Design a protein around this ligand. Structure first.
Ligand SMILES: C[C@@H]1CC(=O)Nc2cccc(C(=O)NCc3ccccc3)c2N1
Length: 115
């Protein structure tokens, strides 16, 4: 089975994550873990079983937690799908998620081809 070294995943994939981070205004609510008490959404973990955010994905890259590039892509999509599930379609977070998904698609395609 092909092994992907953690530094090699990090070098290839981190620019795609940085592209999301730098999207302002749309990345802002995704830059840190959801804090249900602080955001006034105490039902969040009942609806979203597996929370995910940009900083957690960065930490996983930094600490070698992905064996396969598709596992990173899965976490980015988990983050998106959580937002499209929890929020209504009129909301900022929903529409900001849609923008991030558009940006990500463009960034990730050449990278995954190359891997
Ligand atoms: C990602 C996280 C959890 C979620 O899916 N929905 C959500 C609901 C209420 C507030 C928020 C929240 O972050 N509100 C503050 C905010 C929203 C948009 C832009 C700036 C700040 C919220 N965001």
């Amino acid at each position: 089975k092909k092994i992907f070294k953690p530094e090699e995943l990090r070098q290839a994939l981190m620019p795609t994550l940085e592209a999301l981070y730098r999207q302002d205004p749309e990345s802002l609510p995704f830059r840190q873990p959801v804090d249900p008490q602080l955001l006034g959404i105490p039902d969040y973990f009942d609806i979203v079983k597996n929370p995910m955010d940009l900083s957690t994905i960065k930490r996983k890259l930094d600490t070698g937690q992905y064996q396969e590039p598709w596992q990173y892509v899965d976490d980015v999509w988990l983050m998106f799908n959580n937002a499209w599930l929890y929020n209504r379609k009129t909301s900022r977070v929903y529409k900001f998620c849609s923008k991030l998904a558009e940006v990500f698609e463009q960034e990730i395609d050449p990278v995954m081809q190359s891997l």
